[PDB]
Design a protein around this ligand. Structure first.
Ligand SMILES: CCCCS(=O)(=O)Nc1ccc2cnn(C)c2c1
Ligand SMILES: CCCCS(=O)(=O)Nc1ccc2cnn(C)c2c1
Ligand SMILES: CCCCS(=O)(=O)Nc1ccc2cnn(C)c2c1
Ligand SMILES: CCCCS(=O)(=O)Nc1ccc2cnn(C)c2c1
Ligand code: NA
Ligand code: NA
Lengths: 414, 414
């Protein structure tokens, strides 16, 4: 039975990371800010908040808006998530040293929650106002949810597959999972993978608010996202996109790339429980963690750190606490980055995967913000107060998305 | 190096199929109609054709509309593709004998091109008319493109993963590819997989028409879709959804299920060439065919039949002819079912995969409709005139989607 530990799978390393967040457009600055206890969450200044009198008046816009980097041409030719993908793709390749790779061994896998949806409404409006010939010949390629991955694959020249998994909050982690599979099954030697997501606007707020899924602690925005805290009251939107470069250890060594961490295994399960609520017992979500360990060749006692999904909904954090216990990982040091960065849906699993890599690289876990009165019914070792420096050898990143999609990624220190 | 032929991968069989098409809601009736030379393509009767004076006035609506099976509750709770998924999921399970399987070894993988997009506009309109609290608490789960797969996973109780690949025209084949991977990597023993897609309306017609991708032969609708014909002038929409049940041969034998065919291997590559045009040289698309043979353990001389992607665009059919030659499969008997069934985007690769299974089961290939003056620059062995009965041992189904996504599925006679 093949595993990374027993050599049945090739060794796969993470060699570059990039992200744009509510704290910073630079991932190393985001990381420094997280360690300093900074939050990206603010009072929403946009006109649409007062226009609709939204119950939610907080969130984290990108520190550096994607379109401050987009000229007239890109604003014409691409949907928002495509522009974010193009921006992150070029940043990642530069960060990797702009390597010359074999396009036929190079894959792209980028998840997203929705796609180029603003272009659906625009095309609708243009046709209503001017007839069918006022729809752009570019409408299809901007609207299609595979569009961001296709843009990145075309930009970087990836000819070993361009894939787009859609699984809501787990999309960006699932993308990394499928990129790992594409390499270990022999279809590729190198892959760009992660997730992109659109911005905060009034309709997204209304849609998730009507599930009671979002915090309404508007008077103290940086205090609103409280994963595992007794007084949590839902998640906070925090915009992001994130990509990483993974490749076989042999491929990295042959080009002089220095690994930041190892990607050891990936588990994908499903709850088949409810269309938006996670299963209370945490069993299938814990099984995704277990499966990632089976493929890595690890036991639960090896897991020093869990980067929680931790959205700060009442039911979600309780389900995840059961999942971590089910997987035998409840002695691990737990971090919930949505406490500081908010929830970026289809990007967030990729962002948190990057954070897990940086935790392993630097031997430090940032504080979970707002963890002040731990929920009495949840007993996890949540890092809080200030960063915890420790000997983290292996870690699991959790993403448990709406729809019941469970993805666990097992990483190791390089 | 593992292959199906050398036992490195478990044997995987197809045990049930279901589909709704422009010819019939019953896949066996669709098959009989194809063999009889029937077309699902008709003059569009809908009011929107005259309202917009669309250049395209032809297409194939489902013979039996999905919503003639949907009551008030389903019309309230689900997007269109979710309703189609629920309908096909229940039909497939009944067709399979309603087996009791282990939910923890049971996966669902259903592709789609777009998702619950009509619910985006509706939620937009409701909020414009009544404020944020007039958005349904069900809006998120109806809109999210993973919604159809989640509905099916919840309906049938699949807890070994629920996945949604998005790759335009290749989505439904890519779903079958990923379901095969989930089984051969050991994550599941049984999987429901395929693709669903929305209906023909005015905006979809306008969007694809403005690329010049669609036929405008309105005076003879059944003659308009002409894959590989000298006088082809683009594709024709033909609505569909399709699912198949795959499982390990051992799992099928243990429950008395009779296989219809074997699923032997799957290849996924990408062009990285253009956002909507396929690469003229056909090289990466041919490589997807080759990769499916490598994983199956077949050589090109084994391939008796290719179920072409064959959309009947000028550039697409020419690129595919090069791909088939690149893969060494140009002695295979070729069928282009879009000649009769039209193009159903995210469903069509799954539909054509079902047709490939039926070709192998019954030893017959239906006639490619409208193949009357073969394009002098394309030299393939296109089945035409009447069905060709032959000794088809192995076959490849091609799907080459907008964005440059190439999926080839290798099937064998059981
Ligand atoms: C962190 C915020 C996430 C908001 S969302 O989940 O509703 N995705 C999203 C995706 C695409 C677009 C286009 N415009 N808009 C507004 C979009 C929004
Ligand atoms: C521009 C239109 C925004 C559509 S929305 O306001 O309803 N938000 C939204 C809804 C569902 C999903 C699933 N994934 N993701 C990211 C989603 C986002
Ligand atoms: C065979 C026709 C395919 C049309 S399409 O590619 O534009 N998919 C599509 C998907 C969802 C919806 C919801 N409403 N509508 C109209 C939809 C259409
Ligand atoms: C209800 C809104 C329809 C949006 S549309 O008219 O522009 N058609 C459309 C456009 C792009 C894609 C990609 N996959 N698929 C299926 C697509 C379909
Ligand atoms: Na996490
Ligand atoms: Na085909």
């Amino acid at each position: 039975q093949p595993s990374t530990a027993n050599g049945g799978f090739p060794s796969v390393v993470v060699t570059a990371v990039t992200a744009t967040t509510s704290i910073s457009p630079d991932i190393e600055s985001t990381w420094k800010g997280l360690l300093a206890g900074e939050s990206g969450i603010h009072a929403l200044e946009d006109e649409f908040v007062t226009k609709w009198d939204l119950a939610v008046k907080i969130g984290g816009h990108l520190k550096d808006p994607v379109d401050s980097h987009m000229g007239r041409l890109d604003m014409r030719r691409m949907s928002y998530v495509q522009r974010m993908g193009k921006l992150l793709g070029g940043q990642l390749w530069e960060s990797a040293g702009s390597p010359e790779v074999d396009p036929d061994r190079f894959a792209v896998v980028v998840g997203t929650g929705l796609g180029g949806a603003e272009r659906i409404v625009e095309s609708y409006d243009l046709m209503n106002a001017g007839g069918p010939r006022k729809v752009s010949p570019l409408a299809v390629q901007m609207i299609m949810p595979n569009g961001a991955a296709a843009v990145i694959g075309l930009q970087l020249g990836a000819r070993a597959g361009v894939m787009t998994p859609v699984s809501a909050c787990s999309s960006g982690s699932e993308a990394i999972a499928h990129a790992w599979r594409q390499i270990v099954m022999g279809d590729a030697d190198v892959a760009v993978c992660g997730g992109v997501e659109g911005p905060i606007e009034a309709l997204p707020i209304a849609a998730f608010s009507m599930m009671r899924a979002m915090s309404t602690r508007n008077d103290e925005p940086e205090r609103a996202s409280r994963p595992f805290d007794k007084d949590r009251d839902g998640f906070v939107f925090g915009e992001a996109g994130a990509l990483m470069l993974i490749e076989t250890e042999e491929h990295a060594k042959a080009r002089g790339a220095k690994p930041l961490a190892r990607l050891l295994g990936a588990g994908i399960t499903s709850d088949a429980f409810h269309m938006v609520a996670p299963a209370a017992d945490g069993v299938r979500a814990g099984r995704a963690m277990t499966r990632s360990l089976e493929l890595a060749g690890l036991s639960p006692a090896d897991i020093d750190h869990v980067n929680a999904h931790g959205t700060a909904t009442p039911i979600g954090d309780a389900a995840e606490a059961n999942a971590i216990r089910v997987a035998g990982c409840d002695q691990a040091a737990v971090y919930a980055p949505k406490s500081a960065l908010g929830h970026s849906i289809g990007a967030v699993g990729a962002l948190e995967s990057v954070l897990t890599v940086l935790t392993l690289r630097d031997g430090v876990i940032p504080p979970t913000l707002n963890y002040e009165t731990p929920d009495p019914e949840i007993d996890l070792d949540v890092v809080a107060g200030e960063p915890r420096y420790g000997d983290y050898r292996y870690a699991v990143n959790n993403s448990f998305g709406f729809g019941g999609h469970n993805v666990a990624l097992a990483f190791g220190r390089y």
